[PDB]
Each structure stands twice: as C-alpha cells, then as structure tokens.
Short mmCIF file of C-alpha atoms in Angstrom, two decimals:
data_model
loop_
_atom_site.label_atom_id
_atom_site.label_comp_id
_atom_site.label_asym_id
_atom_site.label_seq_id
_atom_site.Cartn_x
_atom_site.Cartn_y
_atom_site.Cartn_z
CA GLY E 1 -24.24 -34.13 47.86
CA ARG E 2 -26.09 -35.66 44.95
CA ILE E 3 -25.51 -38.65 42.71
CA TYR E 4 -25.55 -37.65 39.02
CA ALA E 5 -26.52 -40.30 36.47
CA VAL E 6 -25.13 -39.28 33.06
CA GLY E 7 -26.17 -40.73 29.74
CA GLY E 8 -26.43 -44.45 29.06
CA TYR E 9 -28.64 -46.42 26.74
CA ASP E 10 -32.41 -46.86 27.17
CA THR E 11 -31.46 -44.98 22.10
CA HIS E 12 -28.32 -43.44 23.57
CA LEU E 13 -29.15 -40.67 26.01
CA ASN E 14 -27.98 -37.13 26.46
CA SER E 15 -30.13 -36.80 29.59
CA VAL E 16 -28.75 -36.43 33.12
CA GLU E 17 -30.57 -36.87 36.42
CA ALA E 18 -29.57 -36.26 40.02
CA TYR E 19 -30.42 -38.20 43.17
CA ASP E 20 -31.04 -36.53 46.54
CA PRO E 21 -30.59 -39.00 49.42
CA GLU E 22 -32.38 -36.77 51.92
CA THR E 23 -35.59 -36.92 49.83
CA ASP E 24 -34.93 -40.24 48.02
CA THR E 25 -35.84 -38.51 44.73
CA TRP E 26 -34.33 -38.29 41.24
CA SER E 27 -34.59 -34.89 39.48
CA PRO E 28 -33.73 -33.82 35.94
CA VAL E 29 -30.75 -31.59 35.28
CA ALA E 30 -29.56 -29.99 32.10
CA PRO E 31 -28.88 -32.45 29.26
CA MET E 32 -25.51 -32.92 27.62
CA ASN E 33 -24.63 -31.53 24.20
CA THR E 34 -23.91 -35.09 23.08
CA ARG E 35 -25.72 -38.41 23.53
CA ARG E 36 -23.38 -40.84 25.36
CA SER E 37 -23.43 -44.43 26.57
CA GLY E 38 -20.52 -46.43 27.89
CA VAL E 39 -19.50 -42.97 29.07
CA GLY E 40 -16.98 -42.35 31.85
CA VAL E 41 -17.63 -39.65 34.42
CA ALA E 42 -15.40 -38.05 36.98
CA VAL E 43 -15.40 -35.07 39.31
CA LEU E 44 -12.60 -32.50 39.31
CA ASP E 45 -12.62 -29.02 40.87
CA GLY E 46 -16.39 -28.96 41.38
CA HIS E 47 -17.27 -29.96 37.80
CA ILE E 48 -18.47 -33.28 36.38
CA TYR E 49 -16.67 -34.42 33.21
CA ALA E 50 -18.43 -36.71 30.75
CA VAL E 51 -15.69 -38.56 28.83
CA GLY E 52 -16.29 -40.52 25.62
CA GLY E 53 -19.36 -42.67 24.96
CA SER E 54 -19.56 -41.49 21.30
CA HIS E 55 -23.11 -42.18 20.01
CA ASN E 56 -14.12 -38.57 21.23
CA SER E 57 -15.69 -35.39 22.55
CA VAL E 58 -15.56 -34.47 26.24
CA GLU E 59 -17.89 -32.10 28.14
CA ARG E 60 -17.95 -30.49 31.55
CA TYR E 61 -20.99 -29.73 33.76
CA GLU E 62 -21.00 -26.66 36.01
CA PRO E 63 -23.64 -27.21 38.72
CA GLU E 64 -23.97 -23.55 39.75
CA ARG E 65 -25.05 -22.60 36.22
CA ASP E 66 -26.58 -26.03 35.29
CA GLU E 67 -24.89 -26.19 31.89
CA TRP E 68 -22.53 -28.36 29.92
CA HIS E 69 -19.51 -26.86 28.22
CA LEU E 70 -17.33 -28.58 25.67
CA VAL E 71 -13.64 -29.22 26.38
CA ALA E 72 -10.74 -30.61 24.39
CA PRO E 73 -11.46 -33.96 22.70
CA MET E 74 -9.50 -37.10 23.59
CA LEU E 75 -6.68 -38.38 21.35
CA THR E 76 -8.54 -41.66 20.85
CA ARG E 77 -12.25 -42.41 20.58
CA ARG E 78 -13.36 -44.56 23.54
CA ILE E 79 -16.66 -46.31 24.43
CA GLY E 80 -16.79 -48.37 27.66
CA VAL E 81 -13.99 -46.24 29.03
CA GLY E 82 -13.07 -46.06 32.70
CA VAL E 83 -12.35 -42.60 34.06
CA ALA E 84 -10.74 -41.55 37.31
CA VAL E 85 -9.19 -38.45 38.83
CA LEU E 86 -5.68 -38.55 40.25
CA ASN E 87 -3.52 -35.59 41.27
CA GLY E 88 -5.56 -32.99 39.44
CA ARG E 89 -5.81 -34.87 36.13
CA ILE E 90 -8.55 -36.96 34.51
CA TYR E 91 -7.40 -40.35 33.27
CA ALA E 92 -9.29 -42.09 30.46
CA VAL E 93 -8.49 -45.81 30.65
CA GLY E 94 -9.09 -48.31 27.84
CA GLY E 95 -12.44 -48.59 26.12
CA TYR E 96 -13.31 -49.64 22.60
CA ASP E 97 -12.51 -47.65 19.46
CA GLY E 98 -15.31 -48.21 16.97
CA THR E 99 -10.59 -52.61 18.73
CA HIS E 100 -10.39 -52.94 22.48
CA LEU E 101 -7.88 -50.49 23.88
CA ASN E 102 -5.00 -50.79 26.24
CA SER E 103 -4.10 -47.13 25.85
CA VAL E 104 -4.53 -44.50 28.55
CA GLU E 105 -4.56 -40.70 28.31
CA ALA E 106 -4.70 -37.94 30.92
CA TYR E 107 -6.46 -34.55 30.81
CA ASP E 108 -4.99 -31.45 32.40
CA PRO E 109 -7.67 -28.75 32.90
CA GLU E 110 -5.02 -26.09 33.43
CA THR E 111 -3.86 -26.48 29.81
CA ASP E 112 -7.01 -28.09 28.32
CA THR E 113 -4.94 -30.86 26.71
CA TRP E 114 -4.93 -34.64 26.68
CA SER E 115 -1.56 -36.42 26.91
CA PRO E 116 -0.71 -40.11 26.42
CA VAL E 117 0.18 -42.14 29.53
CA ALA E 118 1.70 -45.65 29.77
CA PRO E 119 -0.64 -48.31 28.35
CA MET E 120 -2.11 -51.17 30.39
CA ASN E 121 -0.78 -54.67 30.09
CA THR E 122 -4.15 -55.89 28.79
CA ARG E 123 -6.70 -54.36 26.44
CA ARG E 124 -9.92 -53.60 28.40
CA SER E 125 -13.34 -52.17 27.51
CA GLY E 126 -16.28 -52.15 29.88
CA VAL E 127 -13.51 -51.66 32.41
CA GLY E 128 -14.06 -50.29 35.90
CA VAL E 129 -11.58 -47.76 37.27
CA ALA E 130 -11.07 -46.34 40.73
CA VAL E 131 -8.43 -44.47 42.69
CA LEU E 132 -7.11 -45.79 46.00
CA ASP E 133 -3.96 -44.71 47.89
CA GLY E 134 -2.51 -42.73 44.94
CA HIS E 135 -2.97 -45.46 42.33
CA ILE E 136 -5.53 -46.04 39.60
CA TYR E 137 -6.95 -49.54 39.49
CA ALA E 138 -8.30 -50.97 36.22
CA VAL E 139 -10.71 -53.83 37.04
CA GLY E 140 -12.01 -56.34 34.48
CA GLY E 141 -12.87 -55.51 30.90
CA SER E 142 -12.60 -57.13 27.42
CA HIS E 143 -11.15 -60.65 32.12
CA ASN E 144 -10.80 -61.34 35.88
CA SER E 145 -7.31 -59.63 35.72
CA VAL E 146 -6.58 -56.34 37.54
CA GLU E 147 -3.85 -53.72 37.20
CA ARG E 148 -2.64 -50.70 39.14
CA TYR E 149 -1.15 -47.50 37.74
CA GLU E 150 1.49 -45.43 39.58
CA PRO E 151 1.91 -41.87 38.20
CA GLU E 152 5.39 -41.22 39.63
CA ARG E 153 6.88 -44.13 37.68
CA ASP E 154 4.24 -44.07 34.88
CA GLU E 155 3.85 -47.88 35.02
CA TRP E 156 0.99 -50.40 35.22
CA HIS E 157 1.56 -53.29 37.64
CA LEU E 158 -0.44 -56.43 38.18
CA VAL E 159 -2.54 -57.13 41.24
CA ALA E 160 -4.73 -59.99 42.27
CA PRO E 161 -7.41 -61.18 39.83
CA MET E 162 -11.04 -61.20 40.90
CA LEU E 163 -12.75 -64.54 41.51
CA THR E 164 -15.18 -63.79 38.67
CA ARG E 165 -14.59 -62.43 35.18
CA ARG E 166 -16.59 -59.17 34.65
CA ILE E 167 -17.16 -56.90 31.64
CA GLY E 168 -19.23 -53.79 32.33
CA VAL E 169 -18.35 -53.88 36.02
CA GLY E 170 -18.93 -50.84 38.25
CA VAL E 171 -16.17 -49.98 40.72
CA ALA E 172 -15.95 -47.69 43.70
CA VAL E 173 -13.89 -47.21 46.85
CA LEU E 174 -15.29 -47.47 50.37
CA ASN E 175 -13.33 -47.66 53.67
CA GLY E 176 -10.04 -48.49 51.99
CA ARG E 177 -11.40 -51.25 49.73
CA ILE E 178 -12.35 -51.39 46.05
CA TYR E 179 -15.80 -52.84 45.42
CA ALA E 180 -16.40 -54.51 42.04
CA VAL E 181 -20.13 -54.62 41.37
CA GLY E 182 -21.96 -56.66 38.77
CA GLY E 183 -20.90 -56.91 35.14
CA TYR E 184 -21.28 -59.66 32.57
CA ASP E 185 -19.48 -63.02 32.50
CA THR E 186 -24.78 -63.85 31.96
CA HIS E 187 -25.27 -60.66 33.99
CA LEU E 188 -24.02 -60.81 37.55
CA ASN E 189 -25.53 -59.79 40.84
CA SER E 190 -22.29 -60.66 42.63
CA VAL E 191 -19.97 -58.17 44.34
CA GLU E 192 -16.36 -58.60 45.56
CA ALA E 193 -14.05 -56.32 47.55
CA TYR E 194 -10.30 -55.76 47.12
CA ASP E 195 -8.04 -55.08 50.10
CA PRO E 196 -4.77 -53.44 48.97
CA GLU E 197 -2.99 -54.21 52.22
CA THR E 198 -3.19 -57.96 51.56
CA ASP E 199 -3.71 -57.85 47.75
CA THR E 200 -6.74 -60.16 48.06
CA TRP E 201 -10.36 -60.17 46.90
CA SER E 202 -13.18 -61.18 49.30
CA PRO E 203 -16.89 -61.87 48.80
CA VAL E 204 -19.52 -59.23 49.49
CA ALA E 205 -23.23 -59.75 49.74
CA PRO E 206 -24.86 -59.94 46.29
CA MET E 207 -27.20 -57.31 44.99
CA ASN E 208 -30.93 -58.03 44.69
CA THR E 209 -30.67 -57.32 40.94
CA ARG E 210 -28.31 -58.56 38.21
CA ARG E 211 -26.54 -55.58 36.60
CA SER E 212 -24.00 -54.83 33.90
CA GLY E 213 -23.25 -51.48 32.45
CA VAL E 214 -23.80 -50.35 36.02
CA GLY E 215 -22.57 -47.11 37.58
CA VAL E 216 -21.33 -47.13 41.19
CA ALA E 217 -20.90 -44.16 43.49
CA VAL E 218 -20.19 -43.64 47.20
CA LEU E 219 -22.23 -41.07 49.09
CA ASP E 220 -22.48 -40.76 52.91
CA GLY E 221 -20.63 -44.04 53.58
CA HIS E 222 -22.88 -46.09 51.31
CA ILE E 223 -22.27 -47.58 47.86
CA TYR E 224 -24.98 -47.01 45.28
CA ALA E 225 -25.41 -49.36 42.32
CA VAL E 226 -27.14 -47.27 39.62
CA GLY E 227 -28.57 -48.76 36.39
CA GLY E 228 -27.02 -51.76 34.54
CA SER E 229 -30.54 -53.10 34.37
CA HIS E 230 -36.59 -51.55 35.99
CA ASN E 231 -34.43 -48.34 36.32
CA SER E 232 -33.58 -50.00 39.71
CA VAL E 233 -31.04 -48.48 42.14
CA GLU E 234 -29.68 -50.20 45.25
CA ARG E 235 -27.64 -49.04 48.19
CA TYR E 236 -25.15 -51.16 50.16
CA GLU E 237 -24.89 -50.90 53.96
CA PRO E 238 -21.47 -52.28 54.97
CA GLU E 239 -22.36 -52.63 58.66
CA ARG E 240 -25.02 -55.17 57.74
CA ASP E 241 -23.58 -56.48 54.44
CA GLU E 242 -26.93 -56.00 52.72
CA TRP E 243 -28.27 -54.26 49.62
CA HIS E 244 -31.56 -52.41 49.73
CA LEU E 245 -33.58 -50.77 46.97
CA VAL E 246 -33.89 -46.98 46.90
CA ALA E 247 -35.84 -44.81 44.48
CA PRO E 248 -35.40 -45.85 40.82
CA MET E 249 -34.16 -43.47 38.13
CA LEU E 250 -36.58 -41.65 35.84
CA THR E 251 -35.05 -43.41 32.84
CA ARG E 252 -33.51 -46.82 32.14
CA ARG E 253 -29.74 -46.37 31.69
CA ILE E 254 -27.33 -49.12 30.68
CA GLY E 255 -23.75 -47.98 30.34
CA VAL E 256 -24.44 -44.96 32.57
CA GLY E 257 -21.71 -42.86 34.13
CA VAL E 258 -22.25 -41.93 37.77
CA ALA E 259 -20.52 -39.33 39.91
CA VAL E 260 -21.09 -37.60 43.23
CA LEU E 261 -21.09 -33.80 43.45
#
C-alpha cells in the first residue's frame, strides 16, 4: 500500500503525505482538522487514526473519501504517545500530559469510547509501541527498560532492556522481531532487534542518519525510517543488513506518526 506520514513538527503540522514505493514519490493527502506532533497513528478496519499530539482529540482518516473525521477524545491528554492496535481496539500508551504518563487507555470503535487499561510499570513518553504475538510492547521512553502487555490478564510484564536508552524511538515488527530505531540518549543512528523467543536484543546495522522523533513502518518486507531528522527517509533491507535512502518527504517532520494503508 502506501506509507502515510501524519503531522509532526517542522510549527506543529496538520499536513499528511503518502509514499508510493512503486514510484518512490511522496504525495499530499487531505490535512487533519488538528495540528499534531508527538502524535500516535494506527490502522484499524481500513482507517488511519491520529491519536493525541495536542498542539486529547482523536481523528480518523477514510482513504476512499480522503477526509478526516473526529472521534471520541481520550480520557487523558497525551503527547509522545505510543499507539498500537490489538484485537480490534486502539491502545494509547503513555505520553506526556502538558507529567510523564504510565497510564494506558483503549478505544473501541464499535462503541466510540475510550476505557482505562492497566498502567505500565514505568512512566514513558516518546515511547515506541508495537504488537507482536498478541502482546503490546512499550519500548523506551521518559529508559532502556521494556514492558509487554497481555490483554487476557490485563497486566504489564517486564522483558529485556535494550542495550541503549532511547527517548523518541520508532518501533516496528518485521519477521517476528521488534526493531527499535533511533531516538535520543545525543540523537542515535543505532538500531536493535528484539527476539521474543529468547527475550534478547541484538544489534542491527545503523542508519545513515541520526533520528529521534522518528516514525517506522513496514511495507513489502522492508522497514522504513521516516523523519526524526533533510526530510530524509531510509529503508532497511534485512537480507543485506543495510539502510538505503529513498525519496525524502515534502516536509520536515519530527515527532511524526507513520502508518501503512
């Protein structure tokens, strides 16, 4: 499909652009009702949700009509929030309330309501979140520590820390592993991968560019590192363990949310 880059800071942006890998081109799409940076983005039922980022409203993009619609606001304001989709709900994890948050809340589109979920062990903003094997992982934040949420028990459990502390880290899942990309410690070009079978982190080739506030998405078996600091965008090829530059975005975006639709 396409990689959508939502919001971020340049001012805080309400603009959205979409990347076509077949043409290696970024194209404008309809802008959001609200300017957002440190925004979380996730895909549920063919819509992109833009969660938080202030600048506690939530909005939903319908690609067929190219428009953003408002939906129920979150119970807590959150900037630097991590967002993931698990079992038909959108989870908003941590962030900063203009206090760093350990709270978590879940959105049900069937009822258009947000509900509190068990809080994390650790307060985290600029946190990366990703879903692997039925669990939500919360990576880094304001930390090298990592935790895993299980919905059936509604509990956060600890897992192995990363080798490097990262705030503003981008996270995505490829071939059974969680990749943690960039962040701030100085801004990092380093990347590490988490294997849930062994509960261990391993080195990955570093990016060409240092990035924090970076968005990460997986399209066609490749990881894209979008923004985070120009307008550079790189793609990872796992078979060669190398990062290569692709077309840059039309706009600089730090604290961008990225999703594939």
